[PDB]
Amino acid sequence: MKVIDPQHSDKPNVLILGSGWGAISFLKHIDTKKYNVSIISPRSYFLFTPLLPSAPVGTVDEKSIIEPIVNFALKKKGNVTYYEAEATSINPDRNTVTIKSLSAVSQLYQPENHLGLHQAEPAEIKYDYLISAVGAEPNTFGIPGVTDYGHFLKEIPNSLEIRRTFAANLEKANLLPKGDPERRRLLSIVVVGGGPTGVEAAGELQDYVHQDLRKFLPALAEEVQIHLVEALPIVLNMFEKKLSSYAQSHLENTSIKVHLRTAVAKVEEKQLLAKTKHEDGKITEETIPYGTLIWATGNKARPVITDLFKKIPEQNSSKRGLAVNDFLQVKGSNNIFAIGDNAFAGLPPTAQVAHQEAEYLAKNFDKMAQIPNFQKIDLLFEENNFKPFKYNDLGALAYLGSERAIATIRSGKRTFYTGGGLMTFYLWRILYLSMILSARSRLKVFFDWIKLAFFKRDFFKGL
Amino acid sequence: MKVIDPQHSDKPNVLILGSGWGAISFLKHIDTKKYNVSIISPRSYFLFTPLLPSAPVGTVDEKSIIEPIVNFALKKKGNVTYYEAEATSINPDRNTVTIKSLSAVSQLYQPENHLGLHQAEPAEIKYDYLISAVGAEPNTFGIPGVTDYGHFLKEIPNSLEIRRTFAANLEKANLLPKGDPERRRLLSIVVVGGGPTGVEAAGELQDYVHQDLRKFLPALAEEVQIHLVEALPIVLNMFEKKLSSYAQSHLENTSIKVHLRTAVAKVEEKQLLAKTKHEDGKITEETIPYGTLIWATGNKARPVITDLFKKIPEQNSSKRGLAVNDFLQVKGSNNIFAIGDNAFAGLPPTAQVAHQEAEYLAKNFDKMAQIPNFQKIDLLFEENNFKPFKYNDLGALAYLGSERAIATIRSGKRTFYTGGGLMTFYLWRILYLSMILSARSRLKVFFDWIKLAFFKRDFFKGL
Ligand SMILES: Cc1cc2nc3c(=O)[nH]c(=O)nc-3n(C[C@H](O)[C@H](O)[C@H](O)COP(=O)(O)OP(=O)(O)OC[C@H]3O[C@@H](n4cnc5c(N)ncnc54)[C@H](O)[C@@H]3O)c2cc1C
Ligand SMILES: Cc1cc2nc3c(=O)[nH]c(=O)nc-3n(C[C@H](O)[C@H](O)[C@H](O)COP(=O)(O)OP(=O)(O)OC[C@H]3O[C@@H](n4cnc5c(N)ncnc54)[C@H](O)[C@@H]3O)c2cc1C
DSSP, X not given: OOEEOOOSXXXXXXXXXXXXXXXXXXXXXXXXXXXXXXXXXXXXXXXXXXXXXXTTTTSSOTGGGEEEHHHHHHHSOSOEEEEEEEEEEEETTTTEEEEEEEEEEEEEXXXXXXXXXXXXXXXEEEOSEEEEOOOOXXXXXXXXXXXXXXXXXXXXXXXXXXXXXXXXHHHHHHTSOTTOHHXXXXXXXXXXXXXXXXXXXHHHHHHHIIIIIHHHOHHHHHHOEEEEEOSSSSXXXXXXXXXXXXXXXXHHHTTEEEETTEEEEEEOSSEEEXXXXXXXXXXXXXXXXXXXXXXXXXXXOOHHHHHHHHHSGGGTTOOSSEEBXXXXXXXXXXXXXXXXXXXXXXXXXXXXXXXXXXXXHHHHHHHHHHSGGGOOXXXXXXXXXXXXXXOOOOEEEEEOSTTOEEEEEEETTEEOOOOSSHHHHXXXXXXXXXXXXXXXXXXXXXXXXXXXXXXXXXXXXXX | OOEEOOOSSSSOEEEEEOSSHHHHHHHHHSOTTTOEEEEEESOSEEEOGGGXXXXXXXXXXXXXXXXXXXXXXXXXXXXXXXXXXXXXXXXXXXXXXXXXXXXXXXXXXOOOOOOOOOTTOOEEEEOSEEEEOOOOEEOOTTOTTHHHHOEEOSSHHHHHHHHXXXXXXXXXXXXXXXXXXXXXXXXXXXXXXXXXXHHHHHHHHHHHIIIIIHHHOHHHHHHOEEEEEOSSSSSSTTSOHHHHHHHHHHHHHTTEEEXXXXXXXXXXXXXXXXXXEOTTSOEEEEEEEOSEEEEXXXXXXXXXXXXXXXXXXXXXXXXXSEEBOTTOBBTTOSSEEEOGGGEESSSOOOHHHHHHHHHHHHHHXXXXXXXXXXXXXXXXXXXXXOOOOOOOOOEEEEEOSTTOEEEEEEETTEEOOOOSSHHHHHHHHHHHHHTOSOHHHHHHHHHHHHHHHHHOOOOXXXX
């Protein structure tokens, strides 16, 4: 029951799923004069994901790296509607999306109708065009105990989960004798995954222990050991070998224990079982005690996207995401497009890709608005002469803790970077500041870093 | 069982109850070379209470107005111990204090012993001298339903309670038709008490509705009605009539409904029953619908202090607090002192009084340290010639919303203030900044106000 469907104004109804890099980047550029835009997301704010590993330890505050959706939609003059809910089903034949857990509906620049909805009432939202940018969810690879005892580093609530857990562990630990193995275990941290997220989590967590906890509890800070576990033989494989080696070397210098070629077989309450392949080809088993476990590895398709694979013939054999065109149209559909991590275009699952794909698609949409026929669609694209999406790889950045970073800025073939250590850290900061999507978030993080210089981090367990 | 008692170092063991204005002001001045100090508080941070009414709505962040105890104790070179727990009983004859809900123990500048305590283990802490600064708790006057449906504005968690409640109400409201009385009720707020806390809560809440909520949901913001209920015939009675009148007039200008001479008889889930005495002497009953109820009125003695009234003969008939001397010694005890809201010295329950009392007492303590006899105590004070505590009333400040405040700065007989509106607001800011107890908190609030100028408030319901 319940079908929300506005059809008086002579503009196509465009429906966006998500409020992340794809959805919000698309929202910033879509022509709200030519189109009526509706967003569906259970998260009422944009998350600047590259600074999330700084949240738990309080190098940056949570509020500093998030921006409410409404602020973005307010800069758009035309009509925008936001449904604070999550899409549970996409319905191609009906051209509707079923929602669930409706918390609120905000209708900006719309002094008009009342939809007649109640909180947590199921509803279908009609669309003329659909943009899917729901993202991916963390992948445990079916390794037992990951979700039971481990914390992902995916969203803002995960930042609070980790702080509470580690804070509780530090308190419990400090009441025990120095020899006690339980004290050593509770002070131990394990981060799984050697990508930017894992490495930066480990580095920020190490920055806290050395720079803050050491000042008032040096006996504890000394006993804290951070571990970083990676299945491949190299950390940060998207960088050059020279930079990976420096990244690894540097982490080791700050007393982070790097387990390369090590895969977690199972996670228990107080330890994880890890297998390690050695140079010669032999496999050995380890046990790594831990008090806090951070899981920052693979991506998996969401149920909403998985369910949609079955409803479209040519998506039936998809796995990692929606198989998409060079025009970012979902294969088999006439009016659904997919950008970011939820779409498979043979590109990396990065914000950089989601951003470009969004800009590309938004520019295609105002081009559609001028052509009479868009007032079957696959053929119109190639017939009306406009370009396939071409990803330009701008490179990669990464913070390694202790005021050192690695960077590679490029464009096309030409590489032109400065990727040492302390200088790259200052670059890493300025560059991250410049690609924040709002002035508020930009000023907030800026103030966070200035405060850090003088007073070094807030670590409140209940806040 | 379990008695913590350090007795090798030749210094008196001074035990402080609380981590508020009294306890921390006393901690800042106590001579840690002449004394060993231990603090017991369930709150591990100092709260700058005058800015608490700015927390819920996000004019200031919660973290900006709190400062960890350890930071204060770190500036003291001598030994300081903090028990994260609450005192459940004071034992005069044993000279110990029973504690409960022990979360942690931190021993600063003490590379020494292990106390052998577990979390939530009952324990008695021995003392040579005791300083009680536990404060008062909010008084409902036994009016039914206050605690069931109302929110106090006393501590940091109360700030989050109010934001969550109002946020939920705004969401529920916006899904209803404009005529609907439920929409009008959910958008209605009632603040009980016309003191600085109540008035400032109302004003800050009104600043949010006009300045922020109006920008993206003007239909909602228009329907929001804030009520301020006061039992006396005047708002802010500590000020001159001229300033109260301007305070009242101004609140009314910003569309706050001021119910003077109105007392709440009972609080129900969706409304409160209020009685109003009129000019001629007649009493009428009202019903005030509400969605959010903030209760900012009287103070009551804590159970810990109430229980102690029975254990000391001369405290048997006490009610509002511990009956104290001119030397701030608890009458009937030889080694217990009381400062702030938990002690009754015939002075107002204010931070200003707690601060002065603390400084006075701390200065008495290093004076005791030089006199051999303190290596029965009532008589030593008057015999050794030092002064009774004399409260100097520096006056009163208050924010009224919409960038207006009222102030009265004085000292002794001489009054010399500037208490108009917009100018007084700038004074009100600078003065509040100057009496914040730490540089960090000072810089944080400073940055909060700068950000407010450009981007106007964060109102995240889950953060
Ligand atoms: C800690 C961390 C650090 C990172 N650092 C970098 C970096 O430095 N550089 C880089 O290029 N990439 C980085 N990434 C990757 C980047 O975050 C993703 O590639 C990017 O967010 C993908 O954009 P998206 O819009 O596809 O998904 P997201 O940006 O994650 O947005 C997905 C949105 O969908 C919403 N949603 C979820 N389920 C539903 C539903 N059922 N209905 C409606 N909405 C839903 C979510 O609330 C969210 O708003 C990082 C990721 C993490 C976790
Ligand atoms: C919202 C608000 C705004 C205010 N604004 C002003 C203002 O502008 N000007 C002004 O002069 N006054 C103001 N006050 C009043 C002022 O804050 C109090 O009078 C002052 O805090 C009294 O200090 P205290 O040390 O007596 O207790 P508090 O400052 O209340 O501190 C009490 C401490 O004791 C701890 N505690 C409680 N129970 C126990 C226990 N059983 N064992 C151990 N510890 C315990 C608490 O955790 C806390 O750390 C305001 C109060 C509030 C609530």
